């Protein structure tokens, strides 16, 4: 069960610090060198830093030298990235990846990054953080199939990405379709998460969307009901 679980991302003003974590499991963590690779939104992959299997060696990208510090704990199987004096151009999704070490060497001639994590979002902006306004989207069965109506939640005007949406606290997953957010000309994101549900049971079964906007520490549990026009 090889897994890399990043965490510790958030939103900070330019100049402040942030610490990342990459919890590894399911393999011999002390036998692999650990990487950090970031990817700006809509851009390519950019290597950040590497640390060898026993922490004796580490290399850094020139764009993070003197500002970032990589470390690891082989008894907790955890990789760290300390980020200081953050700049706007450091905004990206930060991945951690593993690379096998042959015999005290983790150069990467014979092995590559064979396992990556899901990533953790880091936003560095002087713009103001804004929490989402969550409004219900009343069930509409017009463009649905058979005994099915589509209701949903509008997550309007938030900054920055990301937000996550579940339905009935994860108990409702089949039929859920969360659309990618739109970056409005105002600089604020808005997305919509809908779920196709039975039509003739809308006023007797409860549907609640669980919006989570960790950048602003906002959690909304909006109850969605059929409208009363």
């Amino acid at each position: 069960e090889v897994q890399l679980v990043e965490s510790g991302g958030g939103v900070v003003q330019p100049g402040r610090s942030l610490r990342l974590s990459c919890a590894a499991s399911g393999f011999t963590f002390s036998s692999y060198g650990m990487h950090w690779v970031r990817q700006a939104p809509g851009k390519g992959l950019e290597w950040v830093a590497v640390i060898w299997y026993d922490g004796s060696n580490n290399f850094y990208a020139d764009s993070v030298k003197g500002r970032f510090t990589i470390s690891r704990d082989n008894f907790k199987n955890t990789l760290y990235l300390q980020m200081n004096s953050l700049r706007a151009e450091d905004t990206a999704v930060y991945y951690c990846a593993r690379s096998y070490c042959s015999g005290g060497f983790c150069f990467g001639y014979y092995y590559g990054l064979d396992v990556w994590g899901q990533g953790t979002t880091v936003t560095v902006s002087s713009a103001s953080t804004k929490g989402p306004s969550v409004f219900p989207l009343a069930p509409s069965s017009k463009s649905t199939s058979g005994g099915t109506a589509a209701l949903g939640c509008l997550v309007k005007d938030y900054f920055p990405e990301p937000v996550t949406v579940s339905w009935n606290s994860g108990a409702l997953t089949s039929g859920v379709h969360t659309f990618p957010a739109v970056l409005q000309s105002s600089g604020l994101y808005s997305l919509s998460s809908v779920v196709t549900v039975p039509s003739s049971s809308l006023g007797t079964q409860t549907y609640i969307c669980n919006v989570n906007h960790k950048p602003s520490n906002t959690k909304v549990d909006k109850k969605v009901e059929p409208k009363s026009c």
Partner: peptide, 9 residues
């Protein structure tokens, strides 16, 4: 440049 370090010497 940057020296490669070895823990077992």
């Amino acid at each position: 440049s940057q020296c490669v370090n070895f823990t077992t010497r």
